[PDB]
């Protein structure tokens, strides 16, 4: 629904530029010309801010040069647009057909592993891994049996907004019960 809403894509790059503008005027009160995206979008381990981007950020070919010196001399090098978040989140229609077909595969794998008297290991259900709306991940949790008695947890996470002053962006899900429904490692 974000990719279909053009007003939200405009608002998303407006808010992204607003966050970047507050970072830039925290750097220097004079608003720059041609500020490099590398300080925002570099992950926090590598020093940057770790900003996720939902907008078209073209990196100049000027911003990809790097020198390196050893005793033969200075060797110059080069390497593009920054990845957007929507390409790394699976669509909901894809999520539901893969959840349907993957919990179907879990049902057949579970009945054939009850036939073989064993437990479903990690070697079967490794192709189903970051998949399913309750994730298949959630089958392999220690607390999973305990979470079989946590009924009404989604209404509980919705009603956390009247108990916790911190606004929850994942009001609709829980990491424990649904699994991590996204993956931004790549």
């Amino acid at each position: 629904a974000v990719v279909n809403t053009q007003e939200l894509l405009d608002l998303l790059v407006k808010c992204e530029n607003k966050i970047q503008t507050r970072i830039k005027i925290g750097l220097n009160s004079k608003m720059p010309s041609r500020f490099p995206p590398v300080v925002f979008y570099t992950p926090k381990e590598l020093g940057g801010l770790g900003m996720l981007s939902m907008g078209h950020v073209l990196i100049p070919q000027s911003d990809l040069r790097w020198s390196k010196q050893t005793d033969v001399g200075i060797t110059h090098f080069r390497s593009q647009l920054i990845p957007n978040l929507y390409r790394y989140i699976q669509p909901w229609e894809s999520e539901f057909i893969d959840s349907q077909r993957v919990w179907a595969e879990y049902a057949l794998k579970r009945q054939e592993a009850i036939a073989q008297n064993r437990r479903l290991t990690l070697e079967d259900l490794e192709d189903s891994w970051d998949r399913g709306i309750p994730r298949i991940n959630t089958l392999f949790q220690k607390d999973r049996h305990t979470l079989a008695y946590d009924k009404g947890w989604r209404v509980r996470t919705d009603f956390k907004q009247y108990q916790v002053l911190k606004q929850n962006p994942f009001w609709w899900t829980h990491q424990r019960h649904d699994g991590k429904l996204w993956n931004l490692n790549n």
């Binding site: 990719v3 053009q6 894509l9 405009d10 998303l12 790059v13 992204e16 530029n17 970047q20 010309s33 041609r34 500020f35 490099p36 995206p37 981007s53 939902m54 907008g55 078209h56 950020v57 073209l58 100049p60 000027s62 990845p83 957007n84 929507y86 390409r87 790394y88 989140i89 699976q90 669509p91 894809s94 290991t121 990690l122 070697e123 490794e126 891994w129 970051d130 998949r131 392999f140 993956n183 490692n185 790549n186």
Partner: protein, 137 residues
């Protein structure tokens, strides 16, 4: 070329939304696999005797050491003739603890052990030397 975040409106045409979404693999598949393998070879004694209760069972009283043990049982079964389990395993204990406790005395072993197994011939005596060789509050 400014560093401004431009809108994706009009810049989505070559891309799909799942395009470049990836799935991770289970963390430490092989370490948990090795833990489960060591656990299933350590639970062999318990799961072997799980339904066997001291009162109500008949064979109560009666890993690669076991395979030489089984080929010793099968040699005894072939040269002795289809007796129950305790007869063959007691003969296994007898044969292995009598070729181990020779203190490497070898020329005396025919007249005891193939006399026990019925004098097949000494080609099976040089079969049975490798049994006792491949044994070891």
């Amino acid at each position: 070329p400014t560093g401004e975040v431009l809108s994706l409106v009009g810049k989505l045409e070559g891309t799909r939304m799942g395009d470049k979404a990836q799935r991770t693999k289970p963390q430490m598949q092989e370490e948990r696999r090795a833990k489960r393998r060591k656990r299933d070879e350590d639970r062999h004694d318990i799961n072997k005797m799980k339904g066997y209760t001291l009162l109500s069972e008949g064979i109560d009283e009666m890993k690669e050491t076991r395979e030489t043990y089984e080929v010793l049982l099968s040699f005894i079964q072939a040269a002795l003739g289809d007796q129950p389990r305790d007869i063959l395993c007691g003969a296994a204990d007898e044969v292995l603890a009598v070729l181990k406790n020779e203190k490497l005395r070898d020329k005396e072993r025919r007249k005891e052990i193939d006399l026990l197994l019925g004098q097949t011939d000494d080609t099976r005596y040089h079969v049975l030397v490798n049994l006792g060789k491949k044994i070891t509050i």
